[PDB]
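Note to self: the last two entries modelled the partners one at a time, which told us nothing about the interface. This time every component goes in together.
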Amino acid sequence: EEIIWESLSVDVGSQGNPGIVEYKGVDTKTGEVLFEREPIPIGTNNMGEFLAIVHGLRYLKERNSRKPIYSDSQTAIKWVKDKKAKSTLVRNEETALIWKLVDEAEEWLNTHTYETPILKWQTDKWGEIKADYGRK
RNA sequence: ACAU
DNA sequence: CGATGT
Ligand SMILES: [Cl-]
Ligand SMILES: [Cl-]
Ligand SMILES: [Cl-]
Ligand SMILES: [Mg+2]
Ligand SMILES: [Mg+2]
Ligand SMILES: [Rb+]
Ligand SMILES: [Rb+]
Ligand SMILES: [Rb+]
Ligand SMILES: [Rb+]
Ligand SMILES: [Rb+]
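The predicted structure of the combined assembly is written out below.
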């Protein structure tokens, strides 16, 4: 219904899917970029969306912030809730980096606690999430 | 079908 | 048009 403006919004950007993956987090109210991941040579949209949420959790925990996180990814929200990224991407030498980061993100979720609400950004009602890359 |  | 996911 109502956007919670006091929040962090995250999104993935890619060149190809699977392809080059990056992600960023922004203050929902101002658009200020708060973190950006260096591009990863091969990943999927959903792996990137998952990493972006987990990085948001870690970012907010380190800063003692109780703000919620918005993501537009039904898939990534579920994977974080499950603490398990159920990606179909082949595990091979060219995908080793993304899978390392996904494995490390799951490991962090399994060893840390958080109360951060992870909320669905309602694109159909509100437009593109504020962390979007503007490539579509 | 819905979400990317 | 192709892809990733529930
Ligand atoms: Cl990461
Ligand atoms: Cl909330
Ligand atoms: Cl959801
Ligand atoms: Mg997205
Ligand atoms: Mg986007
Ligand atoms: Rb803390
Ligand atoms: Rb986009
Ligand atoms: Rb977009
Ligand atoms: Rb979207
Ligand atoms: Rb589909």
